[PDB]
Amino acid sequence: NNLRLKPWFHWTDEERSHAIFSAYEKRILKSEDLPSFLRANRINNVSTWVFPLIALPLFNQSIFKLGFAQRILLTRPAIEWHCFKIATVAASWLAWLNFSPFYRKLENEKEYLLDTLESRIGINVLDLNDALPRWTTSQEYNRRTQQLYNQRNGFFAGLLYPQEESSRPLVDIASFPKNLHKEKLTK
């Protein structure tokens, strides 16, 4: 409705990626929901480490031949020219990273997966979030999801890696004994 706050309205990119990875690992998300998102993920990676390359000659034809750039080139040492070129390319790279069409597509795919999760488990989608490690990134969690997809949807499934189909026992969780007591320690 655009006025209802989704449960993940405050999550960061790392938190969203970890939620998707945990949902897939816990067999809440099937391998049939990933192939689009995963694809976008790969494109996003190519959209990150290729842009400076794509931006290196283009500027040489568009920006670095302008009057200000030529003035810098002709009236300043070669090291300052290198500094100007590197600073311009790095600023363009940062702007691309913040505002990239493929980054937007990846975020949309993650949002669709989170919407599917909310449609499946309801408000318990918030239970997929945790206190993530500080230096683990959204790309790292996406790569872990891709690795899990390759393990499950490929060879060695059932030999080296757990299968995607769960075989958990059928019990009544209301009456089945639990490991943790409500307040005390039990043995």
Ligand X SMILES: CCCCCCCCCCCCCCCCCC(=O)OC[C@H](COP(=O)([O-])OCC[N+](C)(C)C)OC(=O)CCCCCCCCCCCCCCCCC
Binding site for other proteins (CB under 8 A): 133-136, 158-159, 162-163, 165-172, 176-179, 181, 184-187
Q: Is 161 helix (H, G, I), strand (E, B) or coil?
A: strand
Please identify, using beta-carbon distances, which residue of 34 and 148 lies nearer to other proteins: 148
Q: How far is the CB of 5 from other proteins (least distance, A)?
A: 31
Footprint (CB under 6 A) of ligand X, residues 16-45: 42, 45
Examine residue 81 and tell whether it contacts ligand X (CB under 6 A). Answer: no
Q: Classify each residue of 5-29 as buried b or exposed e, where b means 16 or more C-beta atoms within 10 Å of its C-beta.
A: eebbeebebbbbbbbbbbbbeeebb
Q: How far is the CB of 85 from ligand X (least distance, A)?
A: 9
Select the residue interacting with ligand X from 54, 66, 83, 86 (CB under 6 A): 86
**87 interface partner picked from ligand X, other proteins, none, CB below 5 to 8 A per type:** none
Please identify, using beta-carbon distances, which residue of 75 and 166 lies nearer to other proteins: 166
Please identify, using beta-carbon distances, which residue of 139 and 151 lies nearer to ligand X: 139
Q: Which two tokens stand for residue 12?
A: 């960061």
Contacts 24+ apart (CB under 8 A), 131-140: 132/14, 132/15, 132/18, 136/14, 136/18, 137/14, 138/12, 138/13, 138/14, 138/16, 138/17, 139/17, 139/41, 139/44, 139/45, 140/17
- Please give the DSSP secondary-structure letter assigned to residue 157: B
Q: Which residues bind ligand X (CB under 6 A)?
A: 42, 45-46, 49-50, 52-53, 86, 89-90, 139, 143
